[PDB]
Amino acid sequence: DGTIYVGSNDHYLYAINPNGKLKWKFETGGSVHSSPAIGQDGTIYVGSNDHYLYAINPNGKLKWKFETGGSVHSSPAIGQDGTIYVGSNDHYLYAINPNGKLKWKFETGGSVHSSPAIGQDGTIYVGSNDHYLYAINPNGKLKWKFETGGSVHSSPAIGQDGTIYVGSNDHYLYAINPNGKLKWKFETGGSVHSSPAIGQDGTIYVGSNDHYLYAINPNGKLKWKFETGGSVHSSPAIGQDGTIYVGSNDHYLYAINPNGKLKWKFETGGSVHSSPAIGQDGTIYVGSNDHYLYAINPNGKLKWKFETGGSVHSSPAIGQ
Ligand SMILES: [Cl-]
Ligand SMILES: [Cl-]
């Protein structure tokens, strides 16, 4: 099918066809910064600034909405049994059943902006504003928490071997072993809000507020760093040939070769905080602060752009 879903600061969740024409839009009560996740049956889940986690049917009609105590900026993750996990600015990590009833909630010490990741054994990992990376068991009990030096707004990535990687506002990219002990930390020049991505050879890519996209080896030593013109808050995506795509606050979507050299850059009208998604055909989709969702071909030329009513900070998801 190939529908592209993305939130906008104009309060809507958009469903766009691969040709750039609207399928439907669903109005929430507030800005949709959260990035949608798609369940096995096609349900689209997304948080809103209006405090709700939404479940929207493929036809664009509400399935249910679950009210948390504060804005849902965190992006949901879906477990093997269908449980939907999402953080809230009310300080909790929520686990919601597919029917929209609470499974459990776990209180952290601060707002949960970070988006959860799920391990192979069902462990749920998420950062908190309280400076910790949390590992929560499927039953909602704490497994462990790891203290960084600052707020963990970056969303964790899990390696093949179980290593958990996450940025911190203390400027480091952390690699944490499955037991919750530090493996290594890599110092960038500024806060690491960007969420890491792991390449096929284990290279970890992450943006930094210091304007660079970093490639770090599994041993925690620098592979390369590529300088953009502004802070890299967007989270990288990796194509089949190894190309790394990431937005920058300098307004460009970047395509970087595995060797750290520029492949191409595409200029949007505003900062690219949204994190790119790659379609089956290689199309790269990303939002911009200029209000558009962009579809860029593998050669870096514009396929189409779709104007929403406000900034597109949400990161797109592509349906089957
Ligand atoms: Cl159409
Ligand atoms: Cl974000």
Domain of 163: which CATH number? 2.40.10.480
Does some domain include residue 38?
yes
- Do 256 and 320 belong to one domain? yes
| DSSP bridge pairs for 255 | 245, 264
Domain boundary among 99, 121, 147: 147
- Do 132 and 47 belong to one domain? yes
Ligand 1 centre and the CA of 43: distance in Å?
21
- Do 223 and 238 belong to one domain? no
Does some domain include residue 61?
yes
Indicate which CATH number applies to the domain containing 313.
Answer: 2.40.128.630
Does some domain include residue 120?
yes
Ligand 2 centre and the CA of 72: distance in Å?
11
- Cα separations (Å) of 129 from 44, 116, 126? 26, 14, 10
- Cα separations (Å) of 76 from 79, 149, 213? 10, 25, 25
Method: X-ray
Rounded to an integer, what distance in angstroms lies between the CA atom of residue 81 and that of residue 140? 15
- Ion ligand 1 residue ranges (Cβ < 5 Å): 17, 21
Ligand with an atom nearest the CA of residue 233? 2
Ligand 1 centre and the CA of 18: distance in Å?
8
- Do 245 and 305 belong to one domain? yes
Please check whether residue 234 is in contact with residue 275, taking contact to mean a CB–CB distance below 8 angstroms: yes
Ligand 2 centre and the CA of 87: distance in Å?
12
- Domain hosting 14: range is 1-20+234-320
| Residue 297 DSSP label | -
CA atoms within 13 A on the CB side of 146: 25
Q: Which of 290, 313, 317 is nearest to 302 (CA)?
A: 290
Does some domain include residue 152?
no
Looking at the chain, the number of H-run helices and the number of E-run strands are 0, 32
Domain boundary among 192, 208, 227: 227
Q: What is the resolution of this structure in A?
A: 1.4
Does some domain include residue 25?
no
Domain boundary among 99, 120, 147: 147
- Cα separations (Å) of 106 from 6, 134, 139? 27, 10, 10
Number of domains the chain is built from: 3
